[PDB]
Short mmCIF file of C-alpha atoms in Angstrom, two decimals:
data_model
loop_
_atom_site.label_atom_id
_atom_site.label_comp_id
_atom_site.label_asym_id
_atom_site.label_seq_id
_atom_site.Cartn_x
_atom_site.Cartn_y
_atom_site.Cartn_z
CA UNK A 1 106.06 83.69 154.72
CA UNK A 2 107.21 82.74 151.15
CA UNK A 3 110.65 84.13 150.16
CA UNK A 4 112.59 84.30 146.86
CA UNK A 5 116.20 85.59 146.58
CA UNK A 6 117.56 86.36 143.10
CA UNK A 7 121.29 86.45 142.12
CA UNK A 8 123.16 89.74 141.47
CA UNK A 9 123.28 91.88 138.29
CA UNK A 10 125.10 90.48 135.24
CA UNK A 11 127.02 92.20 132.44
CA UNK A 12 127.73 89.91 129.45
CA UNK A 13 128.74 90.41 125.78
CA UNK A 14 126.70 89.23 122.68
CA UNK A 15 127.13 85.49 122.03
CA UNK A 16 127.94 84.80 125.74
CA UNK A 17 126.02 82.65 128.27
CA UNK A 18 124.47 83.47 131.67
CA UNK A 19 123.26 81.37 134.63
CA UNK A 20 120.75 83.17 136.89
CA UNK A 21 119.57 81.74 140.29
CA UNK A 22 116.35 81.89 142.36
CA UNK A 23 116.59 80.38 145.88
CA UNK A 24 113.27 79.80 147.70
CA UNK A 25 112.61 79.58 151.48
CA UNK A 26 109.82 79.59 154.12
CA UNK A 27 107.60 76.94 152.42
CA UNK A 28 107.72 73.39 150.95
CA UNK A 29 109.61 74.12 147.64
CA UNK A 30 107.57 71.35 145.88
CA UNK A 31 104.08 72.80 146.84
CA UNK A 32 104.22 75.75 144.34
CA UNK A 33 106.01 75.70 140.98
CA UNK A 34 108.35 78.47 139.70
CA UNK A 35 107.56 80.77 136.74
CA UNK A 36 110.09 82.98 134.89
CA UNK A 37 109.08 86.47 133.68
CA UNK A 38 111.34 88.94 131.86
CA UNK A 39 110.96 92.65 131.22
CA UNK A 40 113.01 94.67 128.70
CA UNK A 41 113.75 98.38 129.65
CA UNK A 42 110.52 100.43 129.52
CA UNK A 43 108.67 97.40 128.06
CA UNK A 44 105.93 94.99 129.21
CA UNK A 45 106.07 91.59 130.97
CA UNK A 46 107.09 88.46 129.01
CA UNK A 47 106.03 85.07 130.46
CA UNK A 48 108.94 82.75 129.55
CA UNK A 49 107.46 79.59 131.02
CA UNK A 50 107.73 77.46 134.14
CA UNK A 51 109.48 74.63 136.02
CA UNK A 52 107.71 71.81 137.92
CA UNK A 53 109.27 71.84 141.45
CA UNK A 54 108.74 68.08 142.12
CA UNK A 55 109.55 66.50 138.68
CA UNK A 56 111.93 69.20 137.34
CA UNK A 57 110.20 69.18 133.93
CA UNK A 58 110.34 72.64 132.25
CA UNK A 59 107.70 74.22 129.97
CA UNK A 60 108.75 77.08 127.66
CA UNK A 61 106.53 79.68 125.95
CA UNK A 62 106.94 80.14 122.12
CA UNK A 63 110.37 81.54 121.22
CA UNK A 64 112.01 80.52 124.54
CA UNK A 65 112.88 76.94 123.43
CA UNK A 66 116.56 75.96 122.97
CA UNK A 67 118.31 79.25 123.85
CA UNK A 68 116.70 79.25 127.35
CA UNK A 69 117.05 76.32 129.79
CA UNK A 70 115.09 76.12 133.12
CA UNK A 71 116.93 74.05 135.83
CA UNK A 72 116.52 72.97 139.48
CA UNK A 73 118.65 72.06 142.52
CA UNK A 74 115.96 70.71 144.94
CA UNK A 75 118.59 69.89 147.66
CA UNK A 76 119.22 73.69 148.11
CA UNK A 77 115.69 74.85 146.95
CA UNK A 78 117.10 76.75 143.95
CA UNK A 79 115.57 77.35 140.47
CA UNK A 80 117.91 78.31 137.61
CA UNK A 81 117.64 80.10 134.30
CA UNK A 82 120.37 79.57 131.69
CA UNK A 83 120.54 81.70 128.53
CA UNK A 84 122.97 80.89 125.66
CA UNK A 85 123.90 82.87 122.45
CA UNK A 86 122.92 86.08 124.34
CA UNK A 87 121.53 88.84 122.10
CA UNK A 88 121.36 92.58 122.93
CA UNK A 89 117.49 92.20 122.99
CA UNK A 90 117.85 89.77 125.94
CA UNK A 91 118.78 92.80 128.15
CA UNK A 92 116.31 93.21 130.95
CA UNK A 93 115.21 92.15 134.41
CA UNK A 94 114.50 88.47 134.97
CA UNK A 95 111.97 87.67 137.67
CA UNK A 96 111.33 84.32 139.32
CA UNK A 97 107.95 83.85 141.04
CA UNK A 98 105.80 81.21 142.71
CA UNK A 99 102.98 79.90 140.57
CA UNK A 100 99.48 78.96 141.88
CA UNK A 101 98.95 75.34 143.06
CA UNK A 102 97.83 72.87 140.38
CA UNK A 103 95.01 71.49 142.59
CA UNK A 104 95.28 71.83 146.44
CA UNK A 105 94.47 75.04 148.41
CA UNK A 106 94.40 77.53 145.49
CA UNK A 107 92.27 80.04 147.51
CA UNK A 108 94.72 80.07 150.48
CA UNK A 109 97.62 80.82 148.02
CA UNK A 110 95.85 83.96 146.72
CA UNK A 111 94.23 85.05 150.03
CA UNK A 112 97.23 84.58 152.41
CA UNK A 113 99.64 86.39 150.03
CA UNK A 114 101.60 83.34 148.81
CA UNK A 115 101.78 85.04 145.34
CA UNK A 116 105.32 86.41 145.68
CA UNK A 117 107.77 87.60 142.98
CA UNK A 118 111.53 87.90 143.50
CA UNK A 119 113.32 91.28 143.39
CA UNK A 120 114.55 90.50 139.85
CA UNK A 121 117.98 89.95 138.26
CA UNK A 122 119.12 92.53 135.69
CA UNK A 123 120.96 90.97 132.72
CA UNK A 124 122.78 93.51 130.55
CA UNK A 125 124.00 92.22 127.16
CA UNK A 126 126.41 94.75 125.70
CA UNK A 127 129.20 94.80 123.08
CA UNK A 128 130.88 97.73 124.92
CA UNK A 129 134.22 97.31 126.76
CA UNK A 130 135.40 98.93 130.07
CA UNK A 131 136.37 102.55 129.28
CA UNK A 132 137.20 105.57 131.39
CA UNK A 133 135.52 108.89 130.60
CA UNK A 134 136.82 111.94 128.76
CA UNK A 135 135.88 114.86 130.99
CA UNK A 136 135.25 118.27 129.36
CA UNK A 137 134.66 121.63 131.11
CA UNK A 138 131.36 123.45 130.46
CA UNK A 139 132.46 127.12 130.84
CA UNK A 140 130.21 129.45 132.94
CA UNK A 141 127.14 131.12 131.42
CA UNK A 142 124.63 133.51 133.09
CA UNK A 143 122.06 133.23 130.22
CA UNK A 144 119.87 130.50 131.85
CA UNK A 145 120.32 131.11 135.65
CA UNK A 146 119.12 133.53 138.39
CA UNK A 147 120.47 137.09 138.74
CA UNK A 148 124.08 137.38 139.89
CA UNK A 149 124.72 133.64 139.26
CA UNK A 150 126.40 131.58 136.49
CA UNK A 151 125.96 127.91 135.49
CA UNK A 152 129.15 125.91 134.94
CA UNK A 153 129.63 122.17 134.63
CA UNK A 154 131.43 119.07 133.38
CA UNK A 155 130.66 116.77 130.48
CA UNK A 156 131.52 113.18 131.53
CA UNK A 157 131.81 111.59 128.10
CA UNK A 158 132.00 108.03 126.77
CA UNK A 159 132.39 105.73 129.77
CA UNK A 160 131.50 102.08 130.40
CA UNK A 161 130.01 100.57 132.48
CA UNK A 162 128.02 102.63 135.03
CA UNK A 163 128.64 104.31 137.54
CA UNK A 164 130.77 107.44 137.85
CA UNK A 165 130.86 109.66 140.91
CA UNK A 166 131.01 113.42 140.49
CA UNK A 167 131.90 115.90 143.21
CA UNK A 168 132.93 119.58 143.09
CA UNK A 169 135.95 121.19 144.82
CA UNK A 170 136.81 117.83 146.61
CA UNK A 171 133.40 117.79 148.37
CA UNK A 172 133.68 121.45 149.59
CA UNK A 173 131.05 122.59 147.00
CA UNK A 174 127.65 120.81 147.39
CA UNK A 175 125.01 123.58 147.14
CA UNK A 176 123.56 124.26 143.68
CA UNK A 177 125.03 121.04 142.22
CA UNK A 178 122.95 119.02 139.78
CA UNK A 179 124.33 115.76 138.45
CA UNK A 180 122.08 114.43 135.68
CA UNK A 181 121.40 110.70 134.94
CA UNK A 182 123.45 109.29 132.07
CA UNK A 183 122.49 108.99 128.39
CA UNK A 184 123.34 105.64 126.73
CA UNK A 185 124.50 106.18 123.12
CA UNK A 186 124.27 103.78 120.09
CA UNK A 187 128.00 103.01 120.76
CA UNK A 188 126.94 101.39 124.06
CA UNK A 189 128.88 104.10 125.99
CA UNK A 190 127.38 106.39 128.65
CA UNK A 191 127.68 110.12 129.08
CA UNK A 192 126.46 112.45 131.77
CA UNK A 193 126.73 116.07 132.89
CA UNK A 194 127.11 117.68 136.32
CA UNK A 195 126.23 121.41 136.61
CA UNK A 196 126.69 123.91 139.41
CA UNK A 197 125.15 127.38 139.88
CA UNK A 198 127.57 129.75 141.63
CA UNK A 199 127.70 133.59 142.27
CA UNK A 200 128.80 135.52 139.11
CA UNK A 201 131.09 137.64 141.40
CA UNK A 202 133.09 134.45 142.41
CA UNK A 203 134.34 133.60 138.84
CA UNK A 204 138.05 134.43 138.52
CA UNK A 205 138.30 134.56 142.36
CA UNK A 206 136.99 131.05 143.29
CA UNK A 207 138.44 128.02 141.48
CA UNK A 208 135.92 125.37 140.32
CA UNK A 209 137.10 121.74 139.83
CA UNK A 210 134.86 118.72 139.07
CA UNK A 211 136.24 115.46 140.53
CA UNK A 212 135.22 112.48 138.38
CA UNK A 213 135.78 108.91 139.58
CA UNK A 214 135.19 105.83 137.43
CA UNK A 215 136.02 102.81 139.57
CA UNK A 216 135.57 100.10 136.79
CA UNK A 217 138.36 101.61 134.61
CA UNK A 218 140.36 102.80 137.70
CA UNK A 219 140.21 106.41 136.33
CA UNK A 220 140.11 109.67 138.41
CA UNK A 221 139.92 113.10 136.73
CA UNK A 222 140.07 116.57 138.39
CA UNK A 223 138.92 119.01 135.69
CA UNK A 224 139.41 122.76 136.28
CA UNK A 225 136.38 124.71 134.88
CA UNK A 226 137.58 128.14 133.78
CA UNK A 227 135.55 131.15 132.48
CA UNK A 228 135.91 131.48 128.66
CA UNK B 1 95.80 85.39 121.33
CA UNK B 2 96.47 88.87 122.89
CA UNK B 3 95.38 91.07 125.83
CA UNK B 4 94.87 94.68 124.71
CA UNK B 5 95.44 97.50 127.23
CA UNK B 6 95.63 101.28 126.46
CA UNK B 7 99.28 102.44 126.99
CA UNK B 8 98.30 105.30 129.34
CA UNK B 9 95.75 106.84 131.77
CA UNK B 10 95.78 109.96 134.00
CA UNK B 11 93.92 111.50 136.93
CA UNK B 12 94.12 114.02 139.80
CA UNK B 13 94.09 112.98 143.54
CA UNK B 14 90.59 111.98 144.74
CA UNK B 15 89.37 111.16 141.18
CA UNK B 16 88.24 107.72 139.85
CA UNK B 17 89.92 105.91 136.88
CA UNK B 18 88.98 102.74 134.90
CA UNK B 19 91.81 100.80 133.13
CA UNK B 20 90.54 98.50 130.32
CA UNK B 21 91.80 95.03 129.27
CA UNK B 22 90.38 93.63 125.96
CA UNK B 23 90.65 90.04 124.67
CA UNK B 24 88.71 87.27 122.85
CA UNK B 25 86.58 84.22 123.89
CA UNK B 26 89.58 81.83 124.43
CA UNK B 27 91.52 84.20 126.81
CA UNK B 28 88.91 86.35 128.72
CA UNK B 29 85.28 85.16 129.23
CA UNK B 30 86.12 81.57 130.19
CA UNK B 31 89.42 82.11 132.11
CA UNK B 32 90.08 84.20 135.25
CA UNK B 33 91.60 87.73 134.93
CA UNK B 34 94.41 88.85 137.28
CA UNK B 35 95.59 92.42 137.88
CA UNK B 36 99.15 93.51 138.77
CA UNK B 37 100.56 96.86 139.88
CA UNK B 38 104.18 97.65 139.01
CA UNK B 39 105.63 100.69 140.81
CA UNK B 40 108.88 102.29 139.46
CA UNK B 41 111.93 100.06 140.09
CA UNK B 42 109.96 97.17 141.68
CA UNK B 43 108.48 93.75 140.76
CA UNK B 44 104.74 93.43 139.80
CA UNK B 45 102.46 93.10 142.86
CA UNK B 46 99.10 91.28 142.84
CA UNK B 47 96.08 93.65 143.06
CA UNK B 48 93.13 91.53 141.91
CA UNK B 49 92.84 87.73 141.56
CA UNK B 50 90.00 85.71 139.95
CA UNK B 51 88.30 88.71 138.16
CA UNK B 52 87.26 90.76 141.27
CA UNK B 53 88.91 89.35 144.46
CA UNK B 54 91.23 91.54 146.57
CA UNK B 55 94.07 89.70 148.42
CA UNK B 56 94.79 90.79 152.02
CA UNK B 57 96.28 94.30 152.15
CA UNK B 58 94.86 95.53 148.82
CA UNK B 59 92.82 98.73 149.49
CA UNK B 60 89.03 98.61 148.73
CA UNK B 61 89.71 101.59 146.34
CA UNK B 62 90.84 98.92 143.82
CA UNK B 63 88.07 96.85 142.22
CA UNK B 64 87.95 94.47 139.27
CA UNK B 65 85.17 94.00 136.70
CA UNK B 66 84.67 91.25 134.10
CA UNK B 67 82.32 90.93 131.08
CA UNK B 68 82.50 88.34 128.21
CA UNK B 69 84.96 90.08 125.89
CA UNK B 70 86.51 92.59 128.28
CA UNK B 71 87.90 93.22 131.77
CA UNK B 72 88.47 96.30 133.87
CA UNK B 73 90.29 97.74 136.91
CA UNK B 74 88.58 100.68 138.69
CA UNK B 75 90.61 102.91 141.06
CA UNK B 76 88.57 105.04 143.52
CA UNK B 77 89.91 107.96 145.63
CA UNK B 78 93.10 108.18 143.50
CA UNK B 79 96.32 109.10 145.36
CA UNK B 80 99.83 109.98 144.05
CA UNK B 81 101.09 106.56 145.32
CA UNK B 82 98.80 104.86 142.68
CA UNK B 83 101.07 106.23 139.88
CA UNK B 84 102.31 102.92 138.40
CA UNK B 85 101.97 100.52 135.48
CA UNK B 86 98.93 98.23 135.61
CA UNK B 87 98.86 94.83 133.91
CA UNK B 88 96.02 92.43 133.36
CA UNK B 89 96.86 88.72 133.08
CA UNK B 90 94.98 85.56 131.98
CA UNK B 91 95.62 81.92 130.96
CA UNK B 92 95.34 80.92 127.26
CA UNK B 93 93.90 77.35 127.34
CA UNK B 94 94.45 76.78 123.57
CA UNK B 95 98.19 77.68 123.86
CA UNK B 96 98.56 76.50 127.55
CA UNK B 97 100.46 79.69 128.50
CA UNK B 98 100.13 82.92 130.54
CA UNK B 99 99.53 86.14 128.65
CA UNK B 100 99.87 89.68 129.97
CA UNK B 101 98.44 92.93 128.65
CA UNK B 102 100.91 95.55 127.40
CA UNK B 103 100.26 97.49 130.60
CA UNK B 104 98.68 100.88 131.36
CA UNK B 105 101.01 103.56 132.71
CA UNK B 106 98.83 105.60 135.08
CA UNK B 107 99.98 109.18 135.83
CA UNK B 108 98.60 110.88 138.99
CA UNK B 109 98.80 114.68 138.62
CA UNK B 110 99.30 115.35 142.34
CA UNK B 111 101.17 118.62 141.76
CA UNK B 112 100.62 121.82 139.72
CA UNK B 113 102.25 122.13 136.28
CA UNK B 114 105.90 123.32 136.42
CA UNK B 115 107.66 124.77 133.35
CA UNK B 116 111.12 123.37 132.48
CA UNK B 117 114.35 125.31 133.13
CA UNK B 118 116.69 124.75 130.08
CA UNK B 119 120.52 125.25 129.92
CA UNK B 120 122.35 124.74 126.61
CA UNK B 121 126.14 124.35 126.55
CA UNK B 122 128.11 124.57 123.28
CA UNK B 123 131.07 122.11 122.68
CA UNK B 124 134.14 122.96 124.74
CA UNK B 125 137.35 124.10 123.00
CA UNK B 126 139.10 121.07 124.69
CA UNK B 127 136.57 118.67 123.06
CA UNK B 128 137.04 120.33 119.59
CA UNK B 129 140.86 119.72 120.08
CA UNK B 130 139.99 115.97 120.66
CA UNK B 131 138.09 116.05 117.26
CA UNK B 132 134.61 115.75 118.81
CA UNK B 133 131.72 118.18 119.39
CA UNK B 134 128.86 117.71 121.89
CA UNK B 135 125.98 120.15 122.56
CA UNK B 136 124.52 119.66 126.06
CA UNK B 137 120.86 120.55 126.71
CA UNK B 138 119.92 120.20 130.42
CA UNK B 139 116.21 120.26 131.36
CA UNK B 140 115.08 120.46 134.99
CA UNK B 141 112.28 121.47 137.48
CA UNK B 142 109.40 120.35 135.24
CA UNK B 143 106.09 118.67 136.11
CA UNK B 144 104.46 116.39 134.83
CA UNK B 145 107.42 114.11 133.99
CA UNK B 146 107.22 114.16 130.18
CA UNK B 147 109.00 116.44 127.66
CA UNK B 148 109.76 116.31 123.93
CA UNK B 149 113.12 117.68 122.70
CA UNK B 150 113.90 118.80 119.14
CA UNK B 151 117.23 120.04 117.77
CA UNK B 152 117.81 122.51 114.94
CA UNK B 153 120.73 123.18 112.65
CA UNK B 154 120.25 126.80 111.70
CA UNK B 155 116.47 126.77 111.09
CA UNK B 156 116.02 123.13 110.05
CA UNK B 157 115.48 120.01 112.16
CA UNK B 158 118.31 117.55 113.14
CA UNK B 159 117.47 113.86 113.91
CA UNK B 160 120.97 112.28 113.50
CA UNK B 161 123.25 112.33 116.56
CA UNK B 162 120.44 113.13 119.04
CA UNK B 163 120.32 111.15 122.35
CA UNK B 164 117.66 112.16 124.94
CA UNK B 165 117.34 110.61 128.43
CA UNK B 166 114.04 109.35 129.81
CA UNK B 167 112.70 111.92 132.46
CA UNK B 168 113.67 111.19 136.10
CA UNK B 169 112.24 112.37 139.43
CA UNK B 170 114.50 114.89 141.20
CA UNK B 171 114.90 115.24 145.02
CA UNK B 172 112.31 118.10 144.95
CA UNK B 173 109.69 115.79 143.25
CA UNK B 174 109.97 117.69 139.96
CA UNK B 175 111.58 116.07 136.85
CA UNK B 176 114.85 116.33 134.96
CA UNK B 177 116.11 115.17 131.53
CA UNK B 178 119.05 115.72 129.24
CA UNK B 179 119.54 115.81 125.52
CA UNK B 180 122.82 115.59 123.60
CA UNK B 181 123.61 116.43 120.01
CA UNK B 182 126.73 114.69 118.57
CA UNK B 183 128.39 116.68 115.73
CA UNK B 184 131.73 116.72 113.97
CA UNK B 185 133.81 119.93 114.75
CA UNK B 186 133.30 120.72 110.99
CA UNK B 187 129.43 120.70 111.31
CA UNK B 188 129.65 122.88 114.47
CA UNK B 189 131.88 125.50 112.73
CA UNK B 190 130.09 125.56 109.31
CA UNK B 191 126.57 126.29 110.66
CA UNK B 192 125.39 129.72 111.90
CA UNK B 193 123.83 128.20 115.04
CA UNK B 194 122.33 125.13 116.77
CA UNK B 195 119.20 125.12 118.94
CA UNK B 196 117.70 122.93 121.62
CA UNK B 197 113.88 123.22 121.64
CA UNK B 198 112.03 121.78 124.69
CA UNK B 199 108.21 121.23 124.55
CA UNK B 200 106.16 120.63 127.76
CA UNK B 201 102.37 121.02 128.28
CA UNK B 202 101.89 122.80 124.91
CA UNK B 203 104.59 125.40 125.73
CA UNK B 204 108.04 125.62 124.07
CA UNK B 205 111.42 126.87 125.40
CA UNK B 206 114.28 127.28 122.90
CA UNK B 207 117.96 127.93 123.52
CA UNK B 208 120.47 128.74 120.75
CA UNK B 209 124.33 128.59 120.62
CA UNK B 210 126.77 129.68 117.86
CA UNK B 211 130.52 128.94 117.21
#
């Protein structure tokens, strides 16, 4: 069939540049052109334009001229997207896709599933710098949990970039654990919480420690969560 | 110049839905309409090509309609797997470019309503010592996957310093979300209380904390 492989995720700062690749295989690269479509988080599809696979001539939709350059390397069957003066609004997933034939065998393209889109390359434009989290204990409370149980947790505050791993009691405590997806603040820093529901009769007998690992900043925190 | 789609649609399993796509004479009417399905975390997938044609693999449950000013995607025998964003696409001959509709997020209510469980944590003493104060409002086990969160300082609303996550599907197929209120230790200490108020399906759950 028709295949499209897109380059890995990219984290850049405002004003920087990014080169994104789309390598095609399983068909004559010159038979179908390549279109570029972007999608901002929780937003619709934006048709950026296209590149002619035989002549290499690009065509950009309004607003995509200058800052966005469509390129080709026909010897390795690869289409490229270059973005300069990166803005925070450029954050999103960039898809490469085959475009219908200009004249020959249009029906076959649609019928035999030649309409294929790549997996997409996420481009994150952020002003934030690598930062380890500040981990705070969230002291047990029985006010919002089942009878004879208390909820305790850890606030994993102000880290960048994602991810962090959270475990409890060095992996010995797995039942009743709920690690929530992160919030992204206006500062460009993430925060998340991990909560665990334990028996109320185990507080002050059983020690509870959240183990927080943030590989990008090379930070590991073991935070003891004590009853207040 | 534009393709107009309603932002949302809903239905229960087995039901039939019709997603609309409005345009003009230069976009729809003379040019072919294409329909794409975008499932969470995946690329758009072709559903309908050339107004009403189904490519191989597309279930007969999906059908496309086309009039002069308008276009439509009908979904028969609705299943929970149909919960996705649906986009209509056409070629603008006057501008020589592809235009997409804003998309219709279709929700399939394949489960009974589930009320949210809410836990509110006050700022830790350790955090106050680091000159920061964060209130943590954790929302879980709710269905459908949409909530609205509102914070209160004493009895009045708070907009500043509020960050709420988008809802996310848990392992148990129910949804979770979190909301955070950023305060100075001074604001925390000078107010009688702070509340996290969670609204879901016309019902409200409120939790309050005091220094």
